[PDB]
Design an enzyme around this catalytic site. Structure first.
Site, mmCIF file in Angstrom:
data_model
loop_
_atom_site.group_PDB
_atom_site.id
_atom_site.type_symbol
_atom_site.label_atom_id
_atom_site.label_comp_id
_atom_site.label_asym_id
_atom_site.label_seq_id
_atom_site.Cartn_x
_atom_site.Cartn_y
_atom_site.Cartn_z
ATOM 1 N N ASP A 1 -3.797 33.826 -12.478
ATOM 2 C CA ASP A 1 -4.443 34.938 -12.240
ATOM 3 C C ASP A 1 -4.529 35.375 -10.658
ATOM 4 O O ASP A 1 -5.454 35.950 -10.215
ATOM 5 C CB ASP A 1 -5.834 34.771 -12.876
ATOM 6 N N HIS B 1 -12.728 36.603 -12.753
ATOM 7 C CA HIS B 1 -11.144 36.413 -12.537
ATOM 8 C C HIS B 1 -10.879 35.698 -11.109
ATOM 9 O O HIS B 1 -10.295 36.250 -10.134
ATOM 10 C CB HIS B 1 -10.339 37.254 -12.571
HETATM 11 MG MG MG Z 1 -5.110 37.034 -16.445
HETATM 12 ZN ZN ZN Z 2 -7.081 34.016 -16.738
#
Ligand code: MG
Ligand code: ZN
Ligand code: 7OM
Length: 341
Positions: A122, A81
């Protein structure tokens, strides 16, 4: 200031033509993780330009250049991420635009919001999930646990914090109604990246696909945006086997690190986050079967030109079955030693 020099070039050098990035840049076969990270902010600009969002929405170039760099800087570096994830998720959004005629389904502003949400979705991920936030009694859980989707609420809030940073509000010339609309869309789309939300709306997604998309149905617009967002978010699985394998490595590095932390807290991790228990081929088959394949089947049902995406996901799942035997140690380990017993 590294950012300032990077900003200067991003702003004053010109926006590179998208074809100059790569000759197959607008193809479902292209793997955006191939792009050097140093080139990705320029590519973001190139995609925004090619989708005509800069012209249509009269986006101020200095603001947009600062915004893209701030978004980039707003990601940390966990194995999965990180900014290259958000970049690759945004790229897929671009692919959807270039390959699927979203303008027959969605408003211009919705497609715009989808792309921007992809960039932001994110932000400031710490490489742990929502349950960990609660379990670890984190600041984010203190803020948002009562509402659920803790990380996704945080990502959205980071997106807004960037917008509210002087010189970074790419929408600040919008009408009050358009501004309100954009941020409301960003909220919905970013919250939709909680797979818990996806699983909760899946039957509605099915029903929408069943009866047929109604461009006049505002709930259909919202549902489709959720599906498209999820499709972008999981789009690593639509690439070749190699991408699939590397992405699995990154995801499990991240999972297991969380699991180590949960064990250090006295909590038993999810099986899939426990490096002593997780059996990766079976886990990946389960994920492909129960989560990824149904998503891209829905996408195919709605967009026949997305068929290749689904078939590639099905294919990658088949490959996990075929390599699974390789996780069983036959003969001796390559060091000829049984010391690991
Ligand atoms: Mg996410
Ligand atoms: Zn994502
Ligand atoms: C592109 C991509 C993204 C992605 N996840 C995205 C969503 C959050 C994370 C998550 O919930 N993983 C899950 C979720 C459900 C599962 C169910 C059964 C077995 C494994 C599972 C793993 C990871 N995974 N996960 C694995 N391969 C991925 N490939």
């Amino acid at each position: 200031s590294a950012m300032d020099d990077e900003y200067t070039k991003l702003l004053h050098d010109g926006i590179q033509p998208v074809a100059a990035i790569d000759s197959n840049f607008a193809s479902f076969t292209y793997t955006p993780r191939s792009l050097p990270e140093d080139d990705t902010s320029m590519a973001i600009l190139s995609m925004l330009q090619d989708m005509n969002f800069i012209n249509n929405y009269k986006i101020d170039c200095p603001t947009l250049a600062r915004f893209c760099l701030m978004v980039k800087k707003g990601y940390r570096d966990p194995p999965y991420h990180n900014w290259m994830h958000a970049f690759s998720v945004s790229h897929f959004c671009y692919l959807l635009y270039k390959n699927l005629e979203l303008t027959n389904y969605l408003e211009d502003i919705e497609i715009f919001a989808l792309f921007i949400s992809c960039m932001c979705h994110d932000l400031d991920h710490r490489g742990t999930n929502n349950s960990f936030q609660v379990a670890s009694k984190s600041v984010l859980a203190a803020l948002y646990s009562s509402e659920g989707s803790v990380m996704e609420r945080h990502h959205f809030a980071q997106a807004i914090a960037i917008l509210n940073t002087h010189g970074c509000n790419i929408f600040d010339h919008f009408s009050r109604k358009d501004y309100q609309r954009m941020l409301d869309l960003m909220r919905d789309i970013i919250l939709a990246t909680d797979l818990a939300h996806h699983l909760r709306i899946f039957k509605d997604l099915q029903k929408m696909a069943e009866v047929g998309y109604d461009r006049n149905n505002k709930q259909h617009h919202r549902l489709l945006l959720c599906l498209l967002m999820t499709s972008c978010d999981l789009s690593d699985q639509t690439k070749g086997w190699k991408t699939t394998r590397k992405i699995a490595e990154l995801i499990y590095k991240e999972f297991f690190s969380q699991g180590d932390l949960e064990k250090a807290m006295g909590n038993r991790p999810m099986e899939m986050m426990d490096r002593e228990k997780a059996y990766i081929p079976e886990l990946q088959i389960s994920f492909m079967e129960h989560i990824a394949m149904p998503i891209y089947k829905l996408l195919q049902d709605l967009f026949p030109k997305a068929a290749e995406l689904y078939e590639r996901v099905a294919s990658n799942r088949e490959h996990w079955t075929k390599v699974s035997h390789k996780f069983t140690i036959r003969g001796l380990p390559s060091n000829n030693s049984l010391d690991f017993l």
